Amino acid sequence: EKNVSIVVAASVLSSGIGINGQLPWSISEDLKFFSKITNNKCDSNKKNALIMGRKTWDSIGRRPLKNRIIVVISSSLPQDEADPNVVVFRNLEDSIENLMNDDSIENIFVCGGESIYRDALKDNFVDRIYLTRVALEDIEFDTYFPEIPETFLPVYMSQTFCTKNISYDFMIFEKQEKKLKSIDDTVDLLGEIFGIRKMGNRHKFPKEEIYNTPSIRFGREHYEFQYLDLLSRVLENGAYRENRTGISTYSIFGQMMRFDMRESFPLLTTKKVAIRSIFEELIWFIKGDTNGNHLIEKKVYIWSGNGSKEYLERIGLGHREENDLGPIYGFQWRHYNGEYKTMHDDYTGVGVDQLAKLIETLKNNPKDRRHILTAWNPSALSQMALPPCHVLSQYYVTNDNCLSCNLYQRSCDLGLGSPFNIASYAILTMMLAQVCGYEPGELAIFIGDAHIYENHLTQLKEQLSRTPRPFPQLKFKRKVENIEDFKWEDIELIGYYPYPTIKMDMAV
Amino acid sequence: EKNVSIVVAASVLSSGIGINGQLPWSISEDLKFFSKITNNKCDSNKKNALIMGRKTWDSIGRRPLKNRIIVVISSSLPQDEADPNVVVFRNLEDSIENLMNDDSIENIFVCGGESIYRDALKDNFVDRIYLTRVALEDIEFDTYFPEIPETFLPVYMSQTFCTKNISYDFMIFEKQEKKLKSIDDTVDLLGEIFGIRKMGNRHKFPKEEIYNTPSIRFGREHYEFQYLDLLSRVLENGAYRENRTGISTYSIFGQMMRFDMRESFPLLTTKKVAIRSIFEELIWFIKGDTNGNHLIEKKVYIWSGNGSKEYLERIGLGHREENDLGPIYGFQWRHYNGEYKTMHDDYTGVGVDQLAKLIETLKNNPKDRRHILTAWNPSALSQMALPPCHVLSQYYVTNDNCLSCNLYQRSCDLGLGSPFNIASYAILTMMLAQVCGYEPGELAIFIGDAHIYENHLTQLKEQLSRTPRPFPQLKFKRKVENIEDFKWEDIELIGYYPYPTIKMDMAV
Ligand SMILES: NC(=O)C1=CN([C@@H]2O[C@H](COP(=O)(O)OP(=O)(O)OC[C@H]3O[C@@H](n4cnc5c(N)ncnc54)[C@H](OP(=O)(O)O)[C@@H]3O)[C@@H](O)[C@H]2O)C=CC1
Ligand SMILES: NC(=O)C1=CN([C@@H]2O[C@H](COP(=O)(O)OP(=O)(O)OC[C@H]3O[C@@H](n4cnc5c(N)ncnc54)[C@H](OP(=O)(O)O)[C@@H]3O)[C@@H](O)[C@H]2O)C=CC1
Ligand SMILES: CN(Cc1cnc2nc(N)nc(N)c2n1)c1ccc(C(=O)N[C@@H](CCC(=O)O)C(=O)O)cc1
Ligand SMILES: CN(Cc1cnc2nc(N)nc(N)c2n1)c1ccc(C(=O)N[C@@H](CCC(=O)O)C(=O)O)cc1
Ligand SMILES: Nc1nc(O)c2c(Cc3ccc(C(=O)N[C@@H](CCC(=O)O)C(=O)O)cc3)c[nH]c2n1
Ligand SMILES: Nc1nc(O)c2c(Cc3ccc(C(=O)N[C@@H](CCC(=O)O)C(=O)O)cc3)c[nH]c2n1
Ligand SMILES: O=c1[nH]c(=O)n([C@H]2C[C@H](O)[C@@H](COP(=O)(O)O)O2)cc1F
Numbered sequence A, B: 001e002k003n004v005s006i007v008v009a010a011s012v013l014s015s016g017i018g019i020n021g022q023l024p025w026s027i028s029e030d031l032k033f034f035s036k037i038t039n040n041k042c043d044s045n046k047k048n049a050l051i052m053g054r055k056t057w058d059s060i061g062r063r064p065l066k067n068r069i070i071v072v073i074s075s076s077l078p079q080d081e082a083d084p085n086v087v088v089f090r091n092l093e094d095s096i097e098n099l100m101n102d103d104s105i106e107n108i109f110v111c112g113g114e115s116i117y118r119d120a121l122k123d124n125f126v127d128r129i130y131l132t133r134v135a136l137e138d139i140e141f142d143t144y145f146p147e148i149p150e151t152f153l154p155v156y157m158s159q160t161f162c163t164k165n166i167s168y169d170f171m172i173f174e175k176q177e178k179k180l181k182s183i184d185d186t187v188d189l190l191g192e193i194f195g196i197r198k199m200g201n202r203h204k205f206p207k208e209e210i211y212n213t214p215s216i217r218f219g220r221e222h223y224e225f226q227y228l229d230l231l232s233r234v235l236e237n238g239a240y241r242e243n244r245t246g247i248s249t250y251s252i253f254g255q256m257m258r259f260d261m262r263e264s265f266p267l268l269t270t271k272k273v274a275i276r277s278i279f280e281e282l283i284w285f286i287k288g289d290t291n292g293n294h295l296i297e298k299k300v301y302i303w304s305g306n307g308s309k310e311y312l313e314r315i316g317l318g319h320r321e322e323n324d325l326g327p328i329y330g331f332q333w334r335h336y337n338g339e340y341k342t343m344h345d346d347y348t349g350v351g352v353d354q355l356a357k358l359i360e361t362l363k364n365n366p367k368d369r370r371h372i373l374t375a376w377n378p379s380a381l382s383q384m385a386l387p388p389c390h391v392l393s394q395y396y397v398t399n400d401n402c403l404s405c406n407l408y409q410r411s412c413d414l415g416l417g418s419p420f421n422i423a424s425y426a427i428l429t430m431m432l433a434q435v436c437g438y439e440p441g442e443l444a445i446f447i448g449d450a451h452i453y454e455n456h457l458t459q460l461k462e463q464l465s466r467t468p469r470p471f472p473q474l475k476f477k478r479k480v481e482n483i484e485d486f487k488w489e490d491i492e493l494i495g496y497y498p499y500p501t502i503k504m505d506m507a508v
């Protein structure tokens, strides 16, 4: 009795594994993954058996795999005693003789093909499943991977990787039925004795109900989990709290999220995010534009709520024009401590330009620790339609010439603002990277107040029910001379296949 | 063959467990810990045996413990068949008969006393050790806990707790000799295939050599580990990088540290920290004082390096007086965007006072998400003797009326600056708490550039060789009317017993 694992690479949605007697994709890293995962052995005197259909055996060019014994399933092909590394069986179950005898075989893998995969699961010979999810969909498939039976649960999901602008993950499913103790007990007892006094009780591990894809425990690599687990922690430890809006939240303090921009783009796949709305807001910041109408003309309404007439009169800004938001983001970027009159005035030449000095500092003095962009001005706070949420950002040039970004955010809406903030500063870093001639680095976001508005509860619990899909890719179609020259047409979003969009009302 | 555990509470240094036939301390939580840890049983039909010396049996008033069978070791006391919950044995080894027979006993605990503890370890009957470390030292002990044999390694260290201004921990030692696999292998293989491309390879788990107290793996509760593990991560993944100083560092990006100020004070015990130097710098900030000499007069030299004549002339500030540092920390706190002349001028009335508006906002509108203190001013940056390291801080009022603090730090010296910054903002939060009538909350520090200067390598590796001791306590001797009225004499540091101070030269 030894282990039998399925190794397969299928499309993310339709699970297509092949077209016209070959692979729909060419990914070098995945073949090397197949090579290393099937060559994995504890005993040096043993080999691993690889079961595959005849057509699959044809697809590899009918040649043996090194240090492995290929088992071909065919009712046609002769059983050949010539090649010692290749053997043919008449049916799948008889090829499972590798269990009962032949102790020279340590582990068994099913390399499959649809016909083999389907009745390998159907007859339940499969202990484990190695799935490589690929982001190619709109192409054509004549061959698919059978839907994984409910007996399996994922124990692992890797980070998103990029090869030839194609995103892919690595997942491990296991067949689960059944089910040091000293430390677990002692901590629990201390938690009983001490109340909220013990800090371990102030941050509680989320209950399985609100924990996204609970079956994956030690195996969460994917950085969308960085957001989804923060979502869960707020649903668990969140204190019910009133705020300036009539809509109360559930708030916790001192949280963070890490993101990899090297091999992927941190855009949430559990909800369809409006990327155009995000970009057009970012280039709005970069241009230094405080005019709220310029966003609305482009059909981005996110700032309409804080850009109304009724809201401005309520905060004492009633003198102001309808959508004029005051010295907000991008004003403080391009002009710092500039005296603000209206949105129509020409502010060129006034105030400190941080974004300019930022870019200038990045390429001229990369190892400088002082690259910083701050939106928080105590003097201009009263003039703003709303104080900076993402307050300050620091940028870092790695020795391999990647550009990494840290962002502190004083107040964070996990339903609306956060999905935007994650992607927005991810784009900005990529923009700052191209202008300074760098590759994208890592994105880290630090959140002071992490909250969920009570009207988003039904929606965010829905979003948590969705198992994440690999991050998309974002490439620029041209290299601009100045960072202000970026246009929406220049952005190519590759392999984004999210879950249906979730509607959530903004608290004004 | 069942489990035998030692349960003991000893002083942190001299390991004294008792004085004059009783305990040197009275701690309610610890007795409840003893109660719950010795009442822990899997089977409801079984009881736990507690072995203790005669004098210890005297100390509890010679009365049985509920739901437990007390085993008293004496050569004098009669063996009494009267009380079924108490039994007397002539020697320790014969009392270990609980193993060979009497299956009504599930687990065995040694409640001890010095005479029992010493030859319980000496004859090696002890599988596990439950140690409660107490911060009382300078008092008198007639009874001690024997030095733990090298056969034991700690698997757990709890957070520091406070009872009657006394700090204490909870540790678990186990006797260790000997010594899912699928996930561990798959991740390793992906790490082989992909290079630094895989983000998991960019952040590597520290090698055992540079990992502080390696035996404690899943059991690190203590928040000094938050600093010590960050120390290790930099020693592992740190990129060698040049900077403005002639001394190069090893730098990583995007790190954080959490701290509990409720039950303890986050002051490093692995190195003796100068707390007076820290405080006098903080009250220096609070007063808004930019004069570097005022620190030197109080014999705090930390700013002397950046406060010299040669350093100022080097950065183009040569016009300035010797120790005048410009619009640095506390200037920007008390006066924001104030035009800076010299350190001697009277700045009262000019600039925005953040610290004032901060305190005013905290008690008037606690649930406000806008409490923020920023030292980073793009306009005044060129005038400063050095730009802000701890850039911005946000403060949070919990529903139970505790005050929690978040701090973003753009550049962090782990050898010198960080031990100061951790304690300094811990004090400031406690000060802001008293003025606004709150209890201390949690402290979270976010670090952009976490580095170790190459001259601190020998020192910081030494510091890593020291197993942490419970955090001290910090109490104020009086309640001030204004936050500026704090004096050094007002501070009482309770139960601080660090390792010897480690000298490290500041890079100028
Ligand atoms: N993305 C991935 O990981 C993988 C993709 N693929 C792709 O999928 C395609 C091939 O898959 P697919 O179309 O399903 O063909 P198969 O790879 O499953 O090959 C099937 C062959 O196996 C034999 N066979 C199957 N079932 C039985 C049975 N019950 N008894 C006896 N013999 C049996 C038959 O051979 P015979 O008729 O001669 O008796 C049959 O033609 C290829 O394009 C390949 O590249 C393949 C493997 C992995
Ligand atoms: N901090 C903590 O967790 C604990 C502290 N303590 C403290 O320790 C102090 C007392 O401990 P300690 O001084 O060590 O005294 P003990 O508690 O160890 O009691 C010793 C007695 O046990 C009997 N005994 C010991 N060894 C033998 C033997 N080899 N054969 C037969 N009988 C033996 C003797 O009694 P006899 O006269 O009959 O021969 C001896 O006097 C107290 O202050 C107590 O409160 C105690 C337990 C826990
Ligand atoms: C057609 N086919 C089946 C195939 C293709 N992709 C897969 N991808 C995955 N994730 N899992 C599979 N089971 C899988 N199977 C192939 C094709 C080539 C090789 C192959 O060349 N393997 C080499 C590896 C080549 C290299 O290192 O790039 C080896 O040594 O194992 C294997 C299977
Ligand atoms: C003198 N003595 C020995 C003693 C004292 N402190 C210790 N502290 C520790 N951490 N470990 C020990 N083994 C220990 N032993 C005592 C004194 C009182 C009780 C006691 O009252 N136990 C009650 C608990 C009391 C309560 O719940 O507050 C119980 O039900 O177990 C036990 C041992
Ligand atoms: N209470 C509150 N929450 C916020 O998130 C904000 C913002 C930032 C912001 C960010 C995103 C949106 C938003 O409309 N998100 C959407 C829709 C996006 C779209 O269609 O444009 C969603 O994902 O459901 C709206 C506002 C600006 N002002 C805000 N005030
Ligand atoms: N490169 C660099 N690193 C720094 O940490 C600083 C600081 C802040 C700072 C923080 C701590 C010290 C310091 O000397 N600390 C000491 C000595 C304390 C004392 O005896 O007063 C220590 O505990 O080891 C000196 C300066 C100010 N300027 C700095 N420049
Ligand atoms: O990028 C943003 N992200 C975000 O989450 N908000 C939300 C956070 C908060 O719910 C609201 C305003 O916070 P506050 O009322 O504390 O000023 O705006 C606003 C942004 F601009």
Ligand SMILES: O=c1[nH]c(=O)n([C@H]2C[C@H](O)[C@@H](COP(=O)(O)O)O2)cc1F
Residues within 6 Å of the ligand: A369, A370, B243, B244, B387, B389, B390, B411, B412, B413, B414, B416, B417, B418, B420, B421
């Ligand atoms: O509180 C402080 N903490 C700290 O770590 N530094 C260090 C960080 C850095 O090593 C040095 C100067 O930062 P930089 O040269 O990058 O501007 O001062 C200074 C402080 F005042």
